[PDB]
Amino acid sequence: MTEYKLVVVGAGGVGKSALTIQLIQNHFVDEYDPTIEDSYRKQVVIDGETCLLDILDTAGQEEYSAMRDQYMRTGEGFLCVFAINNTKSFEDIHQYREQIKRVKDSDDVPMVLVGNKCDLAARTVESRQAQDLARSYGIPYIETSAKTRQGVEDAFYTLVREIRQH
């Protein structure tokens, strides 16, 4: 079976884990539980292909940046997550993307841009701004809510679609 190696990155608190746990476990983690590095595996069907998703859920914290340089090397594709209610997380995307391109030594790494927490009324990042950013990177954009599960599969599965195309 094809194994797709997905890495979830971005600022602390954006919902990297909630996205991942919503995908793998079908449960929304309401809790505060900062990550160091966690890994997940789950068989899924994507466009009719039964495949395995290996997900590496990374810390958002700066403290673990050097840990990200090492353990993201074997990622095949990256979810760059921000929260639509947190403009700083959106600004920080640039730095996570650059790190990934460094780690893979490539300007064209399979990647998606993910605007999470779409369930929240207090949006500070307009959808068109993020769409535009994703266009400027040549990557897909997905809006999600880890809380309601909206877009959760779309975010991971669209990344798998990116991997397949590279």
Ligand X SMILES: Nc1nc2c(ncn2[C@@H]2O[C@H](COP(=O)(O)OP(=O)(O)NP(=O)(O)O)[C@@H](O)[C@H]2O)c(=O)[nH]1
Q: Does 154 bind ligand X (CB under 6 A)?
A: no
Site membership for ligand X, residue 14 (CB under 6 A): yes
The Cα–Cα gap between 33 and 151 comes to 22
17 binds Mg ion (CB under 5 A): yes
Among 93, 145, 151, 158, binds ligand X (CB under 6 A): 145
- Binding-site residue total for Mg ion (CB under 5 A)? 3
Q: Tell whether 18 is in a known binding site.
A: yes
Q: Taking a C-beta distance cutoff of 8 angstroms, is the pair 71, 58 a contact? A: yes
Q: Which of 24, 29, 35, 129 binds Mg ion (CB under 5 A)?
A: 35
User: Among ligand X, Mg ion, none, what does residue 53 contact (CB within 5–8 Å per kind)?
Assistant: none
* CA-closest candidate to residue 35, choices 6, 14, 5: 14
For the chain, counts of helices (H) and of strands (E)? 5, 6
CB 104 within 8 A of CB 143: no
51 binds, among ligand X, Mg ion, none (CB under 5 to 8 A by kind): none
